[PDB]
Amino acid sequence: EPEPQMVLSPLTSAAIFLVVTIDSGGEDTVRDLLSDVASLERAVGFRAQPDGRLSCVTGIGSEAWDRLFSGARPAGLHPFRELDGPVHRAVATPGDLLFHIRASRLDLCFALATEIMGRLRGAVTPQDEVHGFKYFDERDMLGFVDGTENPTGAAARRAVLVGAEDPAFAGGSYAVVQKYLHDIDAWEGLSVEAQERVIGRRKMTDVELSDDVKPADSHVALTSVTGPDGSDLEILRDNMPFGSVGREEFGTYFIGYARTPEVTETMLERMFLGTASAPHDRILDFSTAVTGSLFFTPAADFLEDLPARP
């Protein structure tokens, strides 16, 4: 009986990512928005349903949580753990609140972000805002199909949603975000055969590389992680391309939901710190991370009925 937010969304061609920090003494204005946000989603979204598919997933940062809520905390909620790799850095940037707004059209996402930020105006300071558009064939900014091996339906739920491990917050999830910028000129200089050695899948056909062709330092290889037993651990990603052409900004907005942050964090360490037979993820030779933050996205039940302020 707890309802989670729309962490498992259908395919949606548009998205707006909003990350803000809570000003001095903006705690109260925020908690009012947190209650209404579900209702607000419904207002912007209900006409233009069922095509629209407008949703919002709201996330709360580690430190912001303590300023906002009394009572117990989510089990594994900390601030984003910065990774200072030998070559590549996973930076950690400020964010107190996350709004993951998605729809089938960008104007719906825009209308709902306007409502959210309108009532938050004066209590929060914008940190990041990016509008994402999906390609007509699910490909990302590097030209590869993006999202293929995402857990689906029932296993997705089990991989993403808090359960009996933290009963107090079952139905919530942990969201990790990173805004990446690509060296498109560099990447496109590569042969397609060389690019597939980077990702770990065939570009066009989207078939994964056989176990002994797939390089140890390819993306798909490093992001496959298993548990201490004979079973593999997965996350839910909804990557969204973005960019400004004039500024030569070509991006991938990464977002990854998981039952516990330790899964996503493992994958991050393998990509940036590398393993024994892999100095790092080759995707990083073409992708530079300019922000990263960690949030708990609660059950929608938690937002309707908040705890008293600490």
Point out which residues bind its own copies (CB under 8 A): 13-14, 16, 18, 20, 48, 52, 105-108, 110-111, 113-114, 117, 121, 126, 129, 131, 133-136, 241, 243-248, 250
Instruction: Give the Cβ contact number of residue 250 at 10 Å.
Output: 20
Cross-strand pairs, 208? 201
- Residue closest to 134 by CA, chosen among 287, 6, 9, 263: 9
- With CB under 6 A as the contact rule, the residue among 12, 62, 173, 178 that binds ligand HEM is 178
Q: Which of 96, 140, 146, 238 is catalytic?
A: 146
Q: Does 285 bind Ni ion (CB under 5 A)?
A: yes
Q: Does 183 bind Ni ion (CB under 5 A)?
A: no
**235 and 256 Cβ atoms separated by less than 8 Å:** yes
The angle that helices 106-120 and 27-45 make with each other, rounded to 10 degrees, is 150
Cβ at position 132, least distance to Ni ion in Å: 27
Q: Does 256 bind ligand HEM (CB under 6 A)?
A: yes
Which segments are annotated as binding site?
A: 147-149, 219, 237, 239, 254
Nearer to its own copies, 111 or 161 (CB): 111
Cβ at position 13, least distance to ligand HEM in Å: 17
- With CB under 6 A as the contact rule, the residue among 54, 98, 199, 299 that binds ligand HEM is 199
Residue 98 and residue 18: Cα distance in Å, rounded? 6
Q: Does 214 bind ligand HEM (CB under 6 A)?
A: no
Residue 232 and residue 188: Cα distance in Å, rounded? 32
CA angle 139, 142, 143 (to 5 degrees): 40
Is 128 an annotated catalytic residue?
no
**Encoding tokens for residue 213?**
């062709």
Catalytic residues: 146
